[PDB]
Amino acid sequence: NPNYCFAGKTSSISDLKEVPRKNITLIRGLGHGEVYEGQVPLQVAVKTLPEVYSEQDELDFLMEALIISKFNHQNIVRCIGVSLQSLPRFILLELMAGGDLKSFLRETRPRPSQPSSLAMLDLLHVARDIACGCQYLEENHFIHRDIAARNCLLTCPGPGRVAKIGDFGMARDIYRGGCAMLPVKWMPPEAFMEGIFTSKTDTWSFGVLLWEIFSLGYMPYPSKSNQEVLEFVTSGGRMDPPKNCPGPVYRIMTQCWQHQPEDRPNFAIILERIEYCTQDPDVINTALPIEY
Ligand SMILES: C[C@H]1Oc2cc(cnc2N)-c2c(nn(C)c2C#N)CN(C)C(=O)c2ccc(F)cc21
């Protein structure tokens, strides 16, 4: 069975915490593989491997469990354990009741009915949370490869929410696919041209995540196809600021999108800049757009 090394330790499937299947109860679907809300009473999200999947899918599923299980950080979803000795195979994750970040942003947009549903500080706190997760990954020499709103989760809908990175499927595939499935809209030039990935890959992607956050859940590069983005970005093209986006926040995005990786900030610097934004009244007092 496949092994996995993180920090200074190597791990195997035997190291995963097996939870007896009889202790696990599915409660409801959460938005499907398929994902359920479950109980172990400990509340969990249950990631399932469809029995109709192949052997490579099995190994990938397993590797993802190993990956998440070896992290220890507040802004990365916890793995409660697995149930691998019964079918279908389960991975048990920390239940994040706020759901994925993209859906949250789109559904929580300030409206005439909910004008104060979200403010700039809430968005900055989400960004800080994920940047803190990214900093942990960077300092432990782990490259995520698909930092994007769809891959982040929230502990809860309301004000005390904490954002975490919740999916590691792309780092898993590369660890051991199609062109039209590559997240090119989140990738820097050296990644989609040369297949070169470093921590500065994730910096670029984080810039795109920031745009997603401050646009309140829009698809990056509106109206552009993947190939059009590839050509646009290679030629020096960059997204405009999201509506009402404060200059200091947009500045972090454009720094994340520097053409040369050496010119992009590491996550320690990104965190410092996000923190300064949270201190600036002119940033956090900026009203978000209210769609009618
Ligand atoms: C593997 C899965 O994990 C969780 C999903 C949810 C909560 N907690 C965890 N751990 C969740 C979702 N929506 N809702 C309403 C809930 C709830 N409650 C999102 N979802 C359906 C996903 O598949 C998904 C999306 C992105 C990501 F990073 C991980 C996951």
Swiss-Prot record:
Domain Protein kinase: 24-283
Source domain of life: Eukaryota
Effect upon mutating Y175S: In NBLST3; somatic mutation
Family to which this protein belongs: Belongs to the protein kinase superfamily. Tyr protein kinase family. Insulin receptor subfamily.
Subcellular location: Cell membrane
Free-text function comment from the UniProt entry: Neuronal receptor tyrosine kinase that is essentially and transiently expressed in specific regions of the central and peripheral nervous systems and plays an important role in the genesis and differentiation of the nervous system. Also acts as a key thinness protein involved in the resistance to weight gain: in hypothalamic neurons, controls energy expenditure acting as a negative regulator of white adipose tissue lipolysis and sympathetic tone to fine-tune energy homeostasis.
Consequence when changing F71V: In NBLST3; somatic mutation; constitutively activated; retained in the endoplasmic reticulum and Golgi compartments
Name of the protein: ALK tyrosine kinase receptor
Active site residues of this protein: D146
Positions of post-translational Phosphotyrosine modification: Y4, Y36, Y175
Pathology noted in the entry: A chromosomal aberration involving ALK is found in a form of non-Hodgkin lymphoma. Translocation t(2;5)(p23;q35) with NPM1. The resulting chimeric NPM1-ALK protein homodimerize and the kinase becomes constitutively activated. The constitutively active fusion proteins are responsible for 5-10% of non-Hodgkin lymphomas.
Variant or mutagenesis effect after changing I68N: In NBLST3; somatic mutation
Chain positions recorded as ATP binding sites: H32, K47, E94, L95, M96, D167
Subunit structure as annotated in this protein's UniProt entry: Homodimer; homodimerizes following heparin- and ligand-binding. Interacts with CBL, IRS1, PIK3R1 and PLCG1. Interacts with FRS2 and SHC1. Interacts with PTN and MDK.
Tissue: Expressed in brain and CNS. Also expressed in the small intestine and testis, but not in normal lymphoid cells.
Result when mutating A131T: In NBLST3; somatic mutation
Portion of the full-length sequence here: 1093 to 1401 of 1620
Description of its domains: The EGF-like region drives the cytokine specificity for ALKAL2. The heparin-binding region binds heparin glycosaminoglycan. Heparin-binding is required for ALKAL2-driven activation.
Post-translational modifications reported in the UniProt record: Phosphorylated at tyrosine residues by autocatalysis, which activates kinase activity. In cells not stimulated by a ligand, receptor protein tyrosine phosphatase beta and zeta complex (PTPRB/PTPRZ1) dephosphorylates ALK at the sites in ALK that are undergoing autophosphorylation through autoactivation. N-glycosylated.
